[PDB]
Amino acid sequence: DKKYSIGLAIGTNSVGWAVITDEYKVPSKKFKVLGNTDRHSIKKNLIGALLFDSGETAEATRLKRTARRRYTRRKNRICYLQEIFSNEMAKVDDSFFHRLEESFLVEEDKKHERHPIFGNIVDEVAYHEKYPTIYHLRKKLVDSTDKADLRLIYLALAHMIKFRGHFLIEGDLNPDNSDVDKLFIQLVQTYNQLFEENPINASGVDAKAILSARLSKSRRLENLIAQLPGEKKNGLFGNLIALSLGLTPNFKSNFDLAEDAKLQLSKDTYDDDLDNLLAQIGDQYADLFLAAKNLSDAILLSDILRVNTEITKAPLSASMIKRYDEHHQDLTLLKALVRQQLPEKYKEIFFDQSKNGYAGYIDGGASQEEFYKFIKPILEKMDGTEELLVKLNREDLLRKQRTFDNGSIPHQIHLGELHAILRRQEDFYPFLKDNREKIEKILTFRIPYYVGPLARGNSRFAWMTRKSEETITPWNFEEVVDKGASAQSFIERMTNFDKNLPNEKVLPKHSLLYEYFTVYNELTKVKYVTEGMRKPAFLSGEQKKAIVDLLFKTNRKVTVKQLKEDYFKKIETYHDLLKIIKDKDFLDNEENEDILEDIVLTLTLFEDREMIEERLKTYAHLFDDKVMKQLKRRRYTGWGRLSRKLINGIRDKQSGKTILDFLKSDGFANRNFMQLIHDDSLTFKEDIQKAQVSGQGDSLHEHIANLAGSPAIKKGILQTVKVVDELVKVMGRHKPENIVIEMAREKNSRERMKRIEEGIKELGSQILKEHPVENTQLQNEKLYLYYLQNGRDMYVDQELDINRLSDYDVDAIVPQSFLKDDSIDNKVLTRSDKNRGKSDNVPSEEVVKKMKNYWRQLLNAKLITQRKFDNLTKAERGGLSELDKAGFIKRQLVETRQITKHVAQILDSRMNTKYDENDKLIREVKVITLKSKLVSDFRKDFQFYKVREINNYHHAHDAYLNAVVGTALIKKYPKLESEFVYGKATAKYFFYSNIMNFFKTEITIRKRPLIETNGETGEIVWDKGRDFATVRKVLSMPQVNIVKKTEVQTGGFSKESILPKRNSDKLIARKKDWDPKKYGGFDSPTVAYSVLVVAKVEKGKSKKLKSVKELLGITIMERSSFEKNPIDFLEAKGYKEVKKDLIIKLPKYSLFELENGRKRMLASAGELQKGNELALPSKYVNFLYLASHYEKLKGSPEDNEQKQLFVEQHKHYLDEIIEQISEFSKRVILADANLDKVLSAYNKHRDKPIREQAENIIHLFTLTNLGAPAAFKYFDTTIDRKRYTSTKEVLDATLIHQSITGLYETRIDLSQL
Amino acid sequence: TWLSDFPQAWAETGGMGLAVRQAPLIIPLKATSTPVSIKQYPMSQEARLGIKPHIQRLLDQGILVPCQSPWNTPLLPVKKPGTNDYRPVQDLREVNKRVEDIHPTVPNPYNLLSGLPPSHQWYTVLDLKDAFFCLRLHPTSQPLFAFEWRDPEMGISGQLTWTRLPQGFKNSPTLFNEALHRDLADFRIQHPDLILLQYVDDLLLAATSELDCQQGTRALLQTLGNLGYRASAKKAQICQKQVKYLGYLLKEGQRWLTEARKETVMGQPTPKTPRQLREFLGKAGFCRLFIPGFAEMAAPLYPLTKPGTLFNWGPDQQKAYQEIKQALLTAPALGLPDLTKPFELFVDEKQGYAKGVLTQKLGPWRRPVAYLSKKLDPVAAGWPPCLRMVAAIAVLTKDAGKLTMGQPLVILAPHAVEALVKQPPARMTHYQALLLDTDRVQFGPVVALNPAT
DNA sequence: CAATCCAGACTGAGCACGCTGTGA
RNA sequence: GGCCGUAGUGCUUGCUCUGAGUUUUAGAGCUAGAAAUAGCAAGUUAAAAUAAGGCUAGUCCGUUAUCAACUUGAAAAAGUGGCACCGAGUCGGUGCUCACAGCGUGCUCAGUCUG
DNA sequence: GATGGCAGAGTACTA
DNA sequence: TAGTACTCTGCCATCAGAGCAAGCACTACGGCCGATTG
């Protein structure tokens, strides 16, 4: 029995731990070793760390699941089309669909003719000559009027249905609207015809260029407004133009409607909104609205079709055919030009698949960008290529029909083409005439997002309810799926429960009860003061009723002057429904509150007008048709945090009054909701406590999963809990006095590129066009800041130069001393940091005044954020006050993160369980949380320097230092338990600035006592004479329990790339009937775990049985097959007479001990990892830190000079560090070539300064590191990986099974097997 | 010639002993108790060979018998202060916490020698060999004690329980005392003249004349022979005026100090570490009864004993060390207290350290019985000199009671503070009861005393 | 109405460490 | 400190969809050469698969989380491993029991009186 | 973004 | 002398996008509200 404490450092992929005694000494006890080896005990220290792979989110799994569902649904669509065509296709060519299915088959495997469409070579060749591409056939079917072959009709329809297009645009699209100028002129003519008094003139305006510009929609609208007289933004014509170009305008100001009546043209509710607006104003604007709709259709289509639609009903097919013809002509011209001018490059351009060019573009994997990059210099170094170069620059040279840019083609184009084909060919095919509606439904059907998967009780993700038990086809979806119930379940399965009543769902935010409760709470806190009052008095219940009925039930916003005049002077959701239902007695009635709650619940739940109206039909008799229509129009968004049962259902046992009843009848007390729920006399608190008791708590893993945060952090939390339990069991089931814990704070380039592109488009500048920047270049902090600041200085008005980068000053808006934030949201690039003004506060008022407009423009361009703007313009608000400074200083030491609070609560609940007589929980174990700042400052002040590149011991050292610092702090300052233990400006500023000053001997010069005492008690909290020596001794120990968490690999079966056919045994069949050697397949399978098999194999012609011991990699795909029957699985692999008892499961990171303390970790069944950690002396660690100048220099000039002299006198430590590395490599790493290269590089680079030599020596520890080998670099020399690609040696080594702390081990000598 | 006459009493001829009067004794356990099995702790190869001959001989006598029991404790050798005999010790740490507790009745070494009167000048000291093994152990409680002993030569591996009372057991000294006391209780009745002193196993017989001791020794040997106890004949002082008992020399009815003990205390060099000073203090403290004013003499060395301090061997410390070395050279002969006659105590107090000597009448002179000295508590340290003597008497009178067996004694001091207790100028009430009890203490004629005394 | 969220000395009992001594 | 109301940012979970990419097959290559080979012609499209697969047979599910060893277990899960001191190259070595007595010191609890 | 798979060239032991 | 068998070195890893819903966590302003004891 001994008092002890546990210190823990929690990382995303590491959890350090350390047990300390009263004197801050780490104990050491002997531990029994289980197994068949001769070792029966081992001595270990109670300090170490656990290393594990970082956890992952379910984003990739969700994306893969969505892809699977999409593929299944597409195949089902094709199956529906084939089922429709089946009878007539059997009449025409019975084997057409069978031939289509077996297209992916070699000649010897097909049971039909190799040609899939007609089955004979002559017909196939003729068809491919007549229609080189599918778009030729589609256009022929759309335009031609004669009979067409049924297989060709099916092929066109199948292509259209398989590749539909995006569903971004709702409603209908008419491809005939292609010209922009003509439709703009027609809209202007209609506007002039209607608005005769104030006509609009638009002659001489390049409407096509203005509206079809590549700039942002808002910028295009602004340009059109600028180049148009007689109107501006927010006018009638401006709003019409915005609606046409896609923005949502408010038509309230145009006709003085007094209601928003916003119309979005792409939205499905546009027809209803337009009907409502027409009923509001009149029927004379319908022509203008239709003209705007046609203009919008033309605007969106002209950017895609880019073809004349006056001669064809298939503009998309015509555009693809024109692309094909342009490709052919450009190819012929390029071939002729190359033959004329550069005949020697013709082979490498048009014949070599490896190099980019035409051969690599078509036959190879080269993309359009790579093809253009390769062929641009060749075209430039040639004559007669001006138009080809123009097409290359505009990205319209030699384009295939199937490209990446086809993602902006609406499904309505394919729908129109399919409808045209069906109309053309329905006269000859009665079956085509009959099934036109269902074919269109097949093309245009998509499951609503709120319906979810169409499961039948065997899917965890699904929530849909079926009104009828039958197969859900796209044609009976409405009649089989209960859409309203499905959407209600979809919303309710994600909304929160009440926290006071965990089993009760929350009310909508705009619920009538919620509004009444909030209004009454706000009213009860207003203390009126008038003449004749001795003391301020609270409103009574009747006064509150009168005030609510006179003010709140009449006007939306109740102000103090209105309260004083309309009530104190005159006498002394509810409003939205009042204008809709036009009934006051119904809303004031109290027996229709259930109806009102159901109405608001429906409006919150459903976003579709059809669903709202079908749910509200039960209440249609109560209201009129127009009232029902207005109710459908109105929709609320938001969910409250209070349950209906909590608000009005629960009643006090003593008085029989609900919370709302008490709030109404508060009277003189005017106690609010918090007072009501915290009152001890009232039974509301007791009922809340009883409700929370029900359910109690789930498992530890379930609770951690239910926590909010990063999955890696949650995994670290679970590991920390498990190691705490393990340490408690190790220490004799005695709980520690304190548990001091800490938690670390923690394509992006593509996101930066898209953000800068959007910001530049919004701002209208051309900085990216002046000099393009790639994503890898944009990853640089200085370049990112320069590009975000539009190339201009942020603190003063001047222009910066990209070519002059790496010279400007990066400045933090909030000083780094007050807040340590290195994000772009707090970093600013300027020519000189002195322009900001004073360096200890927010930027100066003069600079704020100068650059306020520029910062506002950047904010409107989304280049800077609201937080950045608020921080920048704080000088006008008042700057950083003394209170703010004190707060900022305090928050650097006191942890406030919710994840840390959750971890502390979990540990406290696990540790302290006993209760007192008065139900007061005894704080047996005190859980303390600290930030990394305290420990880092301790290390920097007292020469306990940390270098992460040496070994993994720094995690354990950080845990030990956390324990020591936390225990010392809580000993010295018991009054700080509120801010540290889980459970004025000047005075606060200097208190937390010198909170850690009791460790040091001298302050600022104050001779602080050598022995630190508690004060008011006789407790010695620190002794500088010996406690620092103890810390130094602990940090210098060579034994630290470092454990890598073994795991069984899960995830994808192998690499997703499908390789071509080759005669290799590594290829994996994509289907059971697809031979890899003839069809290609996957490769590089992922091994779930290795299996040690001791068996006999057939070797030689005689097939003699040779005893063999080896490791077999059980991959992810065959893990279930192996686990179902290991005997048969191993026999099928070729092994005979295996031993089930001798079969051993070996997951990843399995540890083996071979000789001289050499440890190897199982990377896979054929690879090994290093498993030994070098324990470099702390003197060498400190010397390396000081010589490398970690984080530059942060010391006083007097202290900085002496450290440089210390390094100068300790120059010779470099050779000793090199010798330590070499001897450790010789004993363990056994990389002779790499060691020789390292030594040669060190010898050749000996004359360089100590700073550079130490910085490069830090990299040398990569060779002597635990884990997978990695390449490093010493100056110019780069050393590759020495991978251990043979696991034969570990078959005679010792297999060690380490617990979560490494103190409990099971050593198995595999040589005896 | 003594060995020949009593073959059934001497261990060198009588063989193993066995108490033929005491019944087998059941070792009780607490109600909430469960068997505990502890693996045999690692033992060095040199210590293993020390016990091995004992196990071989213990097996022959039937003391150690093979058994299978859930109880198991690690055997452990303890070498004797002399040579390397390596006596066997069971190391029953876990069993002791589990076994029940009985009230100890063992005699404390301070009070045994107080019973010896100066009239009985002839002594006969007999020490019983293998004392704790004489009492038989019931087979029900035999599984409680066990240990693992595996020797390939012996051919038996497993647990070997004890059929007798083991060594290292917490109740062994108490159970053996009572068992031996009852057997010899009949012997005391038959010989009123003899004075028998019993210390666990060591027995001392005191008689008046030489013939009385010879008759008593023969009766004692015959009595122990029938009872089964065997006494070692190699070390048995019989009918000698000079005997060694309880670490004290007994000559002319005086409790001398052995010459070897004095050599050990002075032989050590000047201490240099607190561990070295602690070693020297303990030896000196055992002789405190012979050194006059030892509390004040060793006063400087006491504050240096603290674990947290600096070992500064200053000139004052060397003066204290020299005083103890010279005092032990001429240590007097403390007389054996005679309970029949009244006692006399001298009390003196200088500078907060109480000193004195307990004496008894010897002809016309007074012979010292025991030198008493103490350090006054800090509460009495600040008292005036008149009040300090009152506190000094109370402290020393408490010490004298532990040796005088509660017999009345006379307190003689230079001052006349005996009347001051009645009318002094919580604790004081406690002092009044102790010093005013006429039954146990009284104050004689007030008179000073020599500084040496 | 405004501000903040026991010291001393003594006595008694128990315990423990840090050494020794008589024996086993 | 808490109560809010407003705004922004980041992240998480789930659902419905889109465009490509890869793989096999189809789109008759020609001339001169026994032949390798050379010279010309052509290239843009389509079908099928897109984790093998599973039974629960759904227009469902299949890459998240969790996972040292041994014993009891159907499983969920529960159990399994002495301490102290001196040291330190991944941990090593030494020691351990009693009972009574003597001396020095410290701590905790409780009470007393006074400010 | 490391880190394990994989092909290919090189070297070596054995029937 | 050819057939397996083991080692070392360089290359290579499916990728983009659009909606919708619910939630948490953090930052940043403005208004207002706390109670009990000496």
Numbering used by the authors:
A (entry chain A): 2 to 573, 593 to 766, 775 to 1011, 1031 to 1051, 1057 to 1365
B (entry chain E): 24 to 448, 455 to 482
Paper text:
The prime editing system has two components: a prime editor composed of a Streptococcus pyogenes Cas9 nickase (nSpCas9) and an engineered Moloney murine leukaemia virus reverse transcriptase (M-MLV RT); and a prime editing guide RNA (pegRNA) with an sgRNA region and a 3′ extension region. The sgRNA region consists of a guide sequence for targeting the specific site and a scaffold for interacting with SpCas9, whereas the 3′ extension region includes a reverse transcription template (RTT) followed by a primer-binding site (PBS). In prime editing, nSpCas9 recognizes dsDNA targets at a sequence complementary to the guide segment in the sgRNA and flanked by an NGG (where N is any nucleotide) protospacer adjacent motif (PAM), and nicks the NTS. Here we present cryo-electron microscopy structures of the SpCas9–M-MLV RTΔRNaseH–pegRNA–target DNA complex in multiple states.
With these modifications, we reconstituted the termination state of the SpCas9–RTΔRH–pegRNA–target DNA complex using ddATP, and successfully obtained a three-dimensional (3D) reconstruction with an overall resolution of 3.0 Å. The 3′ extension region (U97–G115) is resolved in our density map, and forms an RNA–DNA heteroduplex with the NTS on a weakly positively charged surface facing the RuvC domain of SpCas9. Nucleotides C103–G115 in the 13-nt PBS base-pair with nucleotides dC(−16*)–dG(−4*) in the NTS to form a PBS–NTS heteroduplex. The clear density revealed that nucleotides C98–G102 in the 6-nt RTT base-pair with the newly synthesized (reverse-transcribed) nucleotides dC1†–dG5† in the NTS, and that U97, located at the 5′ end of the RTT, is kinked from the scaffold region and forms a base pair with ddA6† in the NTS. The RTΔRH binds to the PBS–NTS and RTT–synthesized DNA heteroduplexes through the positively charged central groove. Notably, the M-MLV RT catalytic motif (YVDD) is located close to the last U97-ddA6† base pair, indicating that this structure captures the state in which the prime editor has just completed reverse transcription up to the end of the RTT sequence. In our structure, although the RTΔRH proceeds with reverse transcription up to the end of the RTT, there is an approximate 10-Å separation between SpCas9 and RTΔRH, leaving sufficient space for further reverse transcription. In particular, the ribose moiety of C96 stacks and hydrogen bonds with L99 and R116, respectively, whereas the G82-C96 base pair forms a stacking interaction with Y64. These structural observations suggest that, if not halted by ddATP, the RTΔRH would continue reverse transcription beyond the RTT into the scaffold region. Our structure shows that U94 of the pegRNA is positioned close to SpCas9, suggesting that M-MLV RT may not proceed further.
